[PDB]
Design a protein around this ligand. Structure first.
Ligand SMILES: CN(C)c1ccc(C(=O)NCCCCCCC(=O)NO)cc1
Ligand SMILES: [K+]
Ligand SMILES: [K+]
Ligand SMILES: [Zn+2]
Length: 366
């Protein structure tokens, strides 16, 4: 068990390609990975589809059955749907229940691989839908696969660390485990008035027995690789020493990358890659997930690069993908150049945030 598990099948990718907000992204991601032949260095595992019972380990039957109902024909005019979070952000597209069950099952399959000791790293680039609530779709997320995966991992591993490097706050995962000390959630994210989903200030630390077992790092526009890694490393260092996790779930949404229409952070995959490396050197069972990422070519660039990092491989700069070659224009290279725009993060504020978190984590004692 030294070779990473790569969750993939043509049917799975085809289903993931059907998501309204990210059409064909799953195909572009796999295609680039395939073109670099990285899948040949991984153990390819076909994802099982999640059963109703498996999904009900987190979601309520009422939500699941409603989702299943409107999905059968794609009824986007059902009275109850709005209260279930279906609407503009999360349309009731036809087959959405099967799509959600596939993504959920994929993450669960990855978790099962980790449990069975088939690998130390399992990857589901089409997972990471961190906004989904117990009975509410949210932020393009219909099912919280990350939560399902964490719950599966808990069958074998005592403490789970969830690290969320998406541009957005991993609120759905944080909320799901807000009450417990057995799962710690760490989220680095943009935090600004009005910016979705609005939660996750540094003062948000969890509830009850879960107090101080939620960690949030509010960040402003324009952050680049060096500063981001400095922040991420300091937080993760403190978290690791205090929490001593037995397994890790890592969400690597590429909407932080320069050129993403979200136009907030100014990162390159190299910076995120450094964070990933730091986590990998803990040598723990690690479940790798995707997430946001709306510059499709750049998202493919990012996750392909990260797959290379996981494999310890250095990748050729020239894009080898023929099928989607034109999408990588005009320069057709793997590297991504940061935009020209200011880092809005004041060093004093960042330091305040870091100090606050360090104070919070002192309460965390295993
Ligand atoms: C240009 N256009 C049609 C839109 C632009 C922005 C949104 C939006 O922010 N919606 C709120 C939901 C955002 C979910 C973000 C998901 C994510 O990346 N999570 O990590 C909607 C439409
Ligand atoms: K995040
Ligand atoms: K927690
Ligand atoms: Zn996001």
């Amino acid at each position: 068990s030294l070779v990473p598990v790569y969750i993939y099948s043509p049917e799975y990718v085809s289903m993931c390609d059907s998501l309204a907000k990210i059409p064909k992204r799953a195909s572009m991601v796999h295609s680039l990975i395939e073109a670099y032949a990285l899948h040949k260095q991984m153990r390819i595992v076909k994802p099982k589809v999640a059963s109703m019972e498996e999904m009900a380990t987190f979601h309520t039957d009422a939500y699941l059955q409603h989702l299943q109902k409107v999905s059968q024909e794609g009824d986007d005019d059902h009275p109850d749907s709005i209260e279930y979070g279906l609407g503009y952000d999360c349309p009731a597209t036809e087959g959405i229940f099967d799509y959600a069950a596939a993504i959920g099952g994929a993450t669960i399959t990855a978790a099962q691989c980790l449990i069975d000791g088939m690998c130390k790293v399992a990857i589901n680039w089409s997972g990471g839908w961190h906004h989904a609530k117990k009975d509410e779709a949210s932020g393009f997320c219909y099912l919280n696969d990350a939560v399902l995966g964490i719950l599966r991992l808990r069958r074998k591993f005592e403490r789970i660390l969830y690290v969320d490097l998406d541009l957005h706050h991993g609120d759905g995962v944080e909320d799901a485990f807000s009450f417990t000390s057995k799962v710690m959630t760490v989220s680095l994210h943009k935090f600004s008035p009005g910016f979705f989903p609005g939660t996750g200030d540094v003062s948000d630390v969890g509830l009850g027995k879960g107090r101080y077992y939620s960690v949030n790092v509010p960040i402003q526009d324009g952050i680049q690789d060096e500063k981001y890694y400095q922040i991420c490393e300091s937080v993760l260092k403190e978290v690791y020493q205090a929490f001593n996790p037995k397994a890790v779930v890592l969400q690597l949404g590429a909407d932080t990358i320069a050129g993403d229409p979200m136009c907030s952070f100014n990162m390159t995959p190299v910076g995120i890659g450094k964070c990933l490396k730091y986590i990998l050197q803990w040598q723990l069972a690690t479940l790798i997930l995707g997430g946001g990422g709306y510059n499709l070519a750049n998202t493919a660039r990012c996750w392909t690069y990260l797959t290379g990092v996981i494999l310890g491989k250095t990748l050729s700069s020239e894009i080898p993908d023929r099928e989607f070659f034109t999408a990588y224009g005009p320069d057709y290279v793997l590297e991504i150049t940061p935009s020209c725009r200011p880092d809005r993060n004041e060093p004093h504020r960042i330091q305040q945030i870091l100090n606050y978190i360090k104070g919070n984590l002192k309460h965390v004692v295993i």
